[PDB]
Design a protein around this ligand. Sequence first.
Ligand code: ATP
Ligand code: ADP
Ligand code: ADP
Ligand code: ADP
Lengths: 193, 1622, 80
Amino acid sequence: TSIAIGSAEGFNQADKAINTAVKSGRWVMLKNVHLAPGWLMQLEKKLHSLQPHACFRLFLTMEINPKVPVNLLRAGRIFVFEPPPGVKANMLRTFSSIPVSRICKSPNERARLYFLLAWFHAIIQERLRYAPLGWSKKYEFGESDLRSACDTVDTWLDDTAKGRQNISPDKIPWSALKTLMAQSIYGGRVDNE
Amino acid sequence: MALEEFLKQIREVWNTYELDLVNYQNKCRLIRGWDDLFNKVKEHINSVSAMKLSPYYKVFEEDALSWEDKLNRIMALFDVWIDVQRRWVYLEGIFTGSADIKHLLPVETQRFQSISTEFLALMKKVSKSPLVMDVLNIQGVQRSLERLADLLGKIQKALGEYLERERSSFPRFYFVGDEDLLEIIGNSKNVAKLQKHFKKMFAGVSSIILNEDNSVVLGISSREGEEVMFKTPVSITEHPKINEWLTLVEKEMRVTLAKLLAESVTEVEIFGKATSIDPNTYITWIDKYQAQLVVLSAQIAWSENVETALSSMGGGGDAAPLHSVLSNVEVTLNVLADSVLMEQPPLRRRKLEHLITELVHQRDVTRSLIKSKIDNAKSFEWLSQMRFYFDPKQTDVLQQLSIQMANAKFNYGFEYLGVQDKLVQTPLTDRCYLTMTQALEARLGGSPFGPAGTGKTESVKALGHQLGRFVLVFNCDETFDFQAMGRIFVGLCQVGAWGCFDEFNRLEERMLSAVSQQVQCIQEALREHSNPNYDKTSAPITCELLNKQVKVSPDMAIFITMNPGYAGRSNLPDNLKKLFRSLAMTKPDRQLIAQVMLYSQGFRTAEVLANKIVPFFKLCDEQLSSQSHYDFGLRALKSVLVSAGNVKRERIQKIKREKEERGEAVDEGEIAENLPEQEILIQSVCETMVPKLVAEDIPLLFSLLSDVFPGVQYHRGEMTALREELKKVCQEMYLTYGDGEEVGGMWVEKVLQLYQITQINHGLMMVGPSGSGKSMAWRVLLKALERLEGVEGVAHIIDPKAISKDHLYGTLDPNTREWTDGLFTHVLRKIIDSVRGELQKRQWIVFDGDVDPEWVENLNSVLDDNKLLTLPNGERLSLPPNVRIMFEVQDLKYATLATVSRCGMVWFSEDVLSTDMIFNNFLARLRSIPLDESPMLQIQRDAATIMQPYFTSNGLVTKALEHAFQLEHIMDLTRLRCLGSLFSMLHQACRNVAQYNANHPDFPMQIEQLERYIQRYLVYAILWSLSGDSRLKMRAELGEYIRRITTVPLPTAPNIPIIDYEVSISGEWSPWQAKVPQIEVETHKVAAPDVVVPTLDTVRHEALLYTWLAEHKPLVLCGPPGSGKTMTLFSALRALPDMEVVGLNFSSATTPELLLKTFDHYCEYRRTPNGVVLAPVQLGKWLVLFCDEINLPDMDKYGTQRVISFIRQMVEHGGFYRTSDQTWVKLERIQFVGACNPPTDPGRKPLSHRFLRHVPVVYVDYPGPASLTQIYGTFNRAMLRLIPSLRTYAEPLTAAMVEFYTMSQERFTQDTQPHYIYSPREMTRWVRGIFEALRPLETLPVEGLIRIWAHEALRLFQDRLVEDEERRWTDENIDTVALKHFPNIDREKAMSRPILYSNWLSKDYIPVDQEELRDYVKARLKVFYEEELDVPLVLFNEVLDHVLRIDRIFRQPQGHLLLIGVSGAGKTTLSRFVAWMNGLSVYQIKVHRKYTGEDFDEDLRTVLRRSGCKNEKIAFIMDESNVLDSGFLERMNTLLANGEVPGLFEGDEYATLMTQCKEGAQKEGLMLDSHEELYKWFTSQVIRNLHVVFTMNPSSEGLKDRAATSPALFNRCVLNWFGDWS
Amino acid sequence: PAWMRTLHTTASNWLHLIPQTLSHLKRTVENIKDPLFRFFEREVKMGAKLLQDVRQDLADVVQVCEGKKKQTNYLRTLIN
Ligand SMILES: Nc1ncnc2c1ncn2[C@@H]1O[C@H](COP(=O)(O)OP(=O)(O)OP(=O)(O)O)[C@@H](O)[C@H]1O
Ligand SMILES: Nc1ncnc2c1ncn2[C@@H]1O[C@H](COP(=O)(O)OP(=O)(O)O)[C@@H](O)[C@H]1O
Ligand SMILES: Nc1ncnc2c1ncn2[C@@H]1O[C@H](COP(=O)(O)OP(=O)(O)O)[C@@H](O)[C@H]1O
Ligand SMILES: Nc1ncnc2c1ncn2[C@@H]1O[C@H](COP(=O)(O)OP(=O)(O)O)[C@@H](O)[C@H]1O
């Protein structure tokens, strides 16, 4: 049960979902909980005096914000999500996120296209670290851009390759992918010539 | 006798006038012809006033008087009846046509049956005798109509659920408010009333076409008159239900648009694949079909031609038929350009412009395709374009057309868009189209972000219109919460419409996170709708919105346009950002948008014009001076290009008219060839940009024009008729009019520029410093336009910052989801509805006040081209063409680029309104308007003649003002503040002359005496107006300068300044010292609160304040705390018996609500023919609202004090707005006096210049050492008369007092501690304490007097000290001062360090031994333990000191304590012990976690009831921890300062309090019956009985914060620093 | 006080470093036609205004640090 924090009915839904899941053993995720620190303190106090089901899990997804209560941080286990340390780590994360069955489809060139996409994403995200030289500003090149690029690659490869096992590299729609990534997927965030 | 003839005419008209009645479905005879009746009443009222003007009026006065009353009554009745009738009509249609409402809502159905019976009975009575007077003479008719209106309103408000269900029935009703939805549902039978509501439910359908019966819907029409005729007309008789035939109309609209598109495509296939096109055939085809249809057909033909050419070239080595496509496009473009070069009908002209834009885009695309050597139709260089494919073989007409971009495929929605302004399709609108279509194919939203003026909101609209979608634009703000956005989403999903939520980042971050859920579920529903596995035969795709299953239409989409570069905007959560595909729209291609715009408008040199005009705008941006109101962006180029097209059309029409009236020879080609397009563009550029320019930038911009456009000159038109109207209006308004370089020419030019801007922009801003003539400019323009065009001008002036944004725009109730209209919303909706003909008048909504993004960014869609006021409840109000939105501001330092860009600017400088103009206005008003309401007029005329030489250019007043601007004043000096002060003082001089004439009927003032008096008083008033708010040194400087520069006789004293002299009525200077006698105060009146020892400053300030108050002019006293501002004001008001003063104590949390509570208590609202008037309950008395801390109220982040804006509106405009019903309330018999500390003091803010313009400021500084010596020597001489042996010690003692005071005031300042404020208040308390000690004693040696003096010095100057070294300094310096001024005394006897005084061991206040006091306190503590509190206390010396101090304060009237020290030091326990000793009952508020402001109000009511009605002495002990909100501190501040909270007792609580006060007064033996006397007695009792003891910790920043949050804690509470235990 | 003396020395040194005079450009009928002058006049105007404001503020700070003049709200904010 996924609930986005921020509204009073959102708090009611969160309370009801937690009360149901601590008995049924289902998972409850609450997003952007950093926007309600007082309700976070109340939630920590509620969680301390509780004996939930063995399979119950409560995920609280937030941004790193000093307003998050300290007692909640001590009560839970913290996982920090941030850009991967390097190109190799970025490519490993990309290859882990993308399902194997998606890459290993009918065209044998899809694997190489996905590898090139992963390398491009890793290079761009690593260039983001050097803010004035790698880019001009800290662009939000993230997972959404990678997913959109993968969807575009899949769409245009299935369009060009009508279920064939192999497609000649000359026939791959390079212009389509390049233009859509430069103008729509990655170039949409770019506001600099 | 013409008055009698006209009265007889009116009598005959009203005796013959009958209400025009028309039958209503055989139910009753409804009144018809409201406009004629209202116009007749207005005309007769104006005529009666015109007769009141004449003198002969008297012989008929009473009769005419009687007439107006009847007339007024008539108006009043018919100001209600119409509304009533209208309401009933639609309510009837809801309770009769619909059968489900009786089962759903039976109770108010029966209620409406009863009220309908009453209404039909009344209508039958009217039908029996349709005479207007006979109707007016019906008993209780007015009350009956008001009761019917109230009941109808309650029923109408009790119909929300039915309206929601009806919205569910017809989804487009989600975009219609409850009022208009009720109107639509009720008036379903009478279709003619629904025509004004179709614009809110459809994109381009403004009205529908019916037959003569109004039973068959033959088609639809747009706002431009374009009509679409249905192939299958919709029959209303077959489908009586409103929603059913509305749905049929919408479906038939789509079907007929599809069929007409098919026919248009079949027709336009001829023009395609054709080498030469006949212009007549193309024009006939264009006229045959709609604008969107002809553009769509052209796009389809071009796309199919390009596809055929690419299929032909697919071989690679084949020929290139793409050149054929380019040639056909160029031929058609040449035909279109030839067509737009000659006169065309406006609809065909717009069609031709759209076709030119589309074909220029097509030509560019085809040239790009040819240049890229494209031979395959599957090349992405062709696939990335927007391609239109038509399939005539498709059975479903709605699916015959497909629009494809890359892999994205869309179906045309076939929504009728009317004639929409098409956007040049530049490269960024192509990139925008590509990115947004990619987002749509992924079932995501679109997010074009970037600065403002880039195309984000229109590019979204243009893409939606290109796909034939209904795009709804929403101007988001912080009030778009989860529920409002969810309901908007429900409406969009059910309708199948595009939602463009602009300024999306203005929502709260929590609200964005919450709305992410709805966006995600909507996108999931859309994605499951896209899968081919889904079949429409199955259950429709639904989503979970607002706990409801809402069907989702595949045509729906969500777009958000935002500018992330604004600081203070919300950050979208990542889970919300991942739902949208973002695109940076930063640099629009302005060169192409111009070139294409000028090409489509008929300019032959469009390329040269664009290449000259875009760099010109860049040059203006980068070369003119940087101003906050300058905008040279895209919304300013498109404003110039549109104006250029309009000006070219006007010039062509003018040339044709000249040719017609001079011979007969007209040729379109000759005119087009011989036409100065350069001059047209320059004229538009000037008309748009010159008004905003500052004086120095005009030559720069004209030099830029000469550089970029050499040889062309801008000669502005000479609007002779408008200038004559302006001259007449200025003459009747006492305003100076001038032509060119004459006095006032700049102002008249600014007025003409404002008139020019009104015609181009529906949003205006008059930007300029206070007193630059903006208000007079637009008022005179409105009156002149009314007199010239004959259109009545109505202006609604709104102060946007004097009220909250909720009160300005409206409030959505979080519980019942009911919308309450704000001020601007109510005004705009009333104009739009046009119940009383508001659409036939020129409506100007002037936002006079400060502009900040928070309130004005809600007007982006209004001041844009959407012209829509978007509300959170999904309602959209279209701005009528006759409405102008005006912003009269003094600066734009807080407005953003989005606001500045959307509005036309007129810059008024202080040089526009010269000082000669103000002098002329003053002199004309003096010579014309009598001061009494004629000997007074003759006196004014003579005085104006005498003052004429000095009120000239380079005159005495002008030079004096110029010199005074160089001095230093306690407040910022503005010209109009000084000029208003001087004019008020001169009016007072004229009134003084009139009073002298009245006092001497036999011998009135002669010419020479009047001249002498007026000249001397002019010098005196210049001194007191140009230097009143400055120190004595600056007053002396101004006096010396005037003596240098004046020819008026002046006092010949070698060193005494002129400021020390007054002007006697005999026309001679007389020293002020002659009015300052050495008075002898009574012994029992020593240092009393109302006793004032006259001094020079006292008498001068009293005279000045009397001068300013007698004119009812609001005024301000600025000075250090304790200087004597309140004392001087009360002493001056004592000379004005017809003035009742009410004291308000401003704090940092003060809002206009305090003033509203004071008005609700001391004043009353009454209804008059002219509106609502708020006047004091007392008759013949003027209420003086004395605000004591005017500059304390909090200034927001945009530099505005809301209460200061409220007071400025109430002074400048003479009233305010009631937000309960948004009604203008006019103040009567109310004036304003304010007091403040200098703005440089901590916590004080500088008052607005607009506010300071209306309030003269007088600087009341601390009395000097000589003044202090005089005042307190008088007090000490009065006091020491009790003991004769001490009388000879009156002179030294005072000196010692003064000396020590001065020393303390020099040693302890606010730099060390915030509360280190020493004032003559301390000296008054010193005299009071010594007098109280000496009063019971019959004799006393000098040593006892010195001991009392030292004790009082310790209690006043040492109790507040924080550090020990400060207290040691105070002790040592008291000793040294006493020895210095009292030698030869027993030092040890009078200065034994334990200086303790107490009345516990005796009847009198005599010195007490420490050990005896300790034993007595021990015994009293034992009794205290055995009776009240059994908490043993250890007694040490500081405890004895503290209990003595607390007893001292508890024995004083209105004695409040502020004990500051570490928690646990015993402050509360000692306070309770002393209160028990003195017999006071201890009251403490029991604060818990649920303790709110209402609980504190109840506790305050209990305390006030006990201490004011029951005569019970109460010590109210309050701790800083008990304060949970700032309202606690506000009420405590008011109670501490005044002794009564104004809004604490209201409703039945006030009645109960009045009954208890009457009982208490009867117990005391007083005869009080009136509520005012009862409240005054209650306040006196509360003052005498309630002692508030405030305890807090010794915080550093907390004390400084409290010094501003609760000022009375440091002025009315004695501060005792207990601190920590030493 | 220590911070008062430190701020006094810093403000005196800053006043020594910053120049004192900057004369506005003179308008002429033929000077306006030159875009370079149209830009340099803006440059000099802004520079002179900022220089005057900064010099006045630093002089006020030095005056406060010596106790000759009282602290105001703007002076308190600037010193902070
Ligand atoms: N044409 C005129 N000739 C003479 N006096 C004028 C003229 N126009 C305005 N004034 C006077 O000059 C003063 C300016 O008032 P006005 O209301 O025009 O100023 P404003 O720009 O609205 O100031 P603020 O910004 O404070 O509202 C008033 O005394 C006004 O009556
Ligand atoms: N391609 C274009 N062709 C013509 N006018 C355009 C074009 N792009 C923007 N405009 C105009 O620019 C102005 C600002 O555009 P708009 O989208 O309202 O701004 P914003 O992006 O700040 O919301 C409007 O007058 C709009 O019609
Ligand atoms: N001429 C005077 N005669 C009597 N009291 C005076 C005179 N001048 C100053 N004072 C004292 O100055 C104080 C003024 O305080 P108040 O009237 O509250 O002024 P403010 O509102 O400016 O603080 C009073 O204590 C008053 O007795
Ligand atoms: N002189 C004293 N001797 C003994 N106990 C004291 C003394 N002064 C204060 N106390 C203690 O203070 C407690 C309550 O503190 P209180 O008087 O309420 O101080 P505060 O209100 O400043 O917190 C009492 O229970 C008592 O024990």
